[PDB]
């Protein structure tokens, strides 16, 4: 079972790791560099990474110390640009890495976004996945603007209806032989094989018809961040792809066999959903060499910007805390007994958050090229997830070790593909054959649904001129 391979990324300087920008190797600082972004697909394309995963924001992390003061300073997730920015540029310079792009449905109109994810499948061929957010930091609210007469006890009734109108335009809307381009006939679209699709539900009124042809896809691949309560509905009905949190071999046993069921309570296949989890691989020619490498990045480590990260992710204001108390007696029970599951207590709560600057919340693994590939198939394996959302440390230096390191040795042991399947994005990682979704995917009960419905040519009325 092949192991599926991630570069994460964001358009911005510090992303997962705090201070280690500073590193000599790291060209962090370039995230606003076109040849930064062309380079790493690149790059990815010569060890076969299945895909580059850019995360986005579009707030600030303003909770420690009551502002955003220390992530500026440490430039942790700000500046940021828009994720949509270098993918052309990058998909001319590659032939089959994917590229998921991370947009929310907080803000953007369904029908707009719909547009915006069509025209990047139509340059990249076939190889976008569209990571599915709801934007959660405080200020993106204040400076975007929410309707608030929206209640958010309906978040996801909400997040429903939106997909429901991306999948009406993507999948419904025009048939696949409405598109013609026949230059002869002078015909370009058969206008009675695109339908409006007349959507009228709570929260969308949508009555007209996709305004992009079919793309290659047709509906990009679906990526979406593991949940609990509700939100594991939303995610086990629409993801194909699922980025998932998990500290523990032990503890993802549980989440990806819980993933799984969802799957197929809501009429999936377990096998339906590949699971990605985030991980962080400091690793060079030993042991010895991958943990002097870890020690010289956090050398350059800035606690204060893990301490804003923190906070946008946590809600916790370090300021208030005590940074010599030992990690045990921290009171907040969710943060202490994740901390306490990432370290390896009776350290300070300053010498973890020091220790923390590499990985963020997610586990960093350090070592040898067998000491890396022997974790590395134990969390596939044992943990049950489908392959990895690296992370970096110092960028591109974290994607190039993993390729130069662990990828020959994943490939000897079998695990790692050394070639590209050839097709779309989804045919490469979910294994249709047409790389459209699978028919227990939701987006396909919008598939060929309104042939013989209303179509633009119904309304067409006579002309002297025609």
Not at 34 to 43: F, G, P, R, S, V
Not at 136 to 154: C, R, V
Request: aromatic share 10%; net charge negative; proline share 4%.
């Amino acid at each position: 079972k092949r192991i599926v391979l991630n570069a994460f990324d964001m358009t911005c300087v510090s992303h997962q790791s705090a201070g280690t920008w500073r590193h000599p190797s790291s060209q962090a600082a370039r995230y606003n560099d076109l040849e930064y972004w062309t380079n790493m697909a690149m790059e990815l394309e010569r060890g076969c990474f299945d895909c580059l995963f850019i995360a986005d924001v579009v707030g600030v992390y303003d909770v420690y110390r009551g502002s955003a003061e220390m992530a500026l300073r440490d430039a942790d997730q700000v500046p940021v640009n828009d994720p949509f920015g270098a993918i052309s540029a990058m998909a001319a310079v590659t032939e089959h890495v994917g590229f998921g792009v991370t947009a929310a449905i907080t803000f953007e109109q369904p029908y707009l976004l719909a547009r915006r994810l069509s025209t990047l499948d139509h340059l990249t061929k076939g190889r976008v996945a569209w990571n599915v957010v709801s934007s959660y930091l405080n200020s993106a609210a204040l400076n975007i603007g929410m309707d608030q007469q929206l209640a958010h006890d309906e978040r996801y009734e909400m997040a429903d209806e939106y997909m429901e109108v991306m999948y009406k335009l993507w999948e419904g809307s025009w048939e696949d032989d409405a598109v013609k381009r026949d230059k002869k006939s002078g015909v370009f679209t058969d206008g009675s094989k695109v339908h409006p699709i007349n959507h009228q539900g709570k929260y969308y009124k949508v009555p007209g018809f996709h305004i992009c042809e079919p793309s290659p896809q047709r509906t990009p691949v679906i990526f979406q961040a593991g949940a609990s309560g509700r939100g594991s509905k939303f995610a086990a009905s629409n993801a194909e792809g699922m980025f998932i949190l998990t500290t523990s071999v032990e503890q993802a046993r549980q989440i990806t066999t819980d993933i799984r069921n969802q799957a197929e309570a809501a009429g999936r296949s377990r096998d339906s959903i590949k699971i990605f989890m985030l991980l962080t691989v400091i690793t060079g020619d030993s042991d010895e060499a991958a943990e002097a490498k870890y020690q010289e990045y956090l050398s350059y480590a800035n606690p204060e910007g893990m301490l804003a990260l923190y906070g946008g992710w946590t809600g916790i204001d370090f300021a208030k805390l005590d940074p010599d108390e030992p990690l045990q007696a921290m009171e907040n029970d969710s943060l202490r007994t994740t901390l306490e599951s990432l370290t390896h207590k009776k350290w300070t709560v300053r010498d973890v958050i020091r220790e923390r600057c590499i990985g963020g919340l997610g586990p960093v693994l350090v070592g040898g090229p067998q000491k890396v590939a022997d974790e590395l198939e134990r969390w596939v394996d044992e943990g049950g997830v489908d392959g990895f959302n690296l992370a970096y440390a110092v960028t591109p230096g974290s994607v190039t070790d993993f390729i130069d390191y662990i990828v020959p040795e994943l490939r000897k042991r079998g695990r790692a593909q050394d070639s590209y399947k050839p097709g779309s994005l989804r045919r490469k990682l979910i294994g249709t054959n047409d790389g459209r979704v699978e028919s227990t995917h939701p987006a396909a009960q919008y598939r060929d649904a309104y042939v013989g419905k209303e179509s633009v040519a119904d309304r067409t009325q006579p002309s002297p001129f025609a």
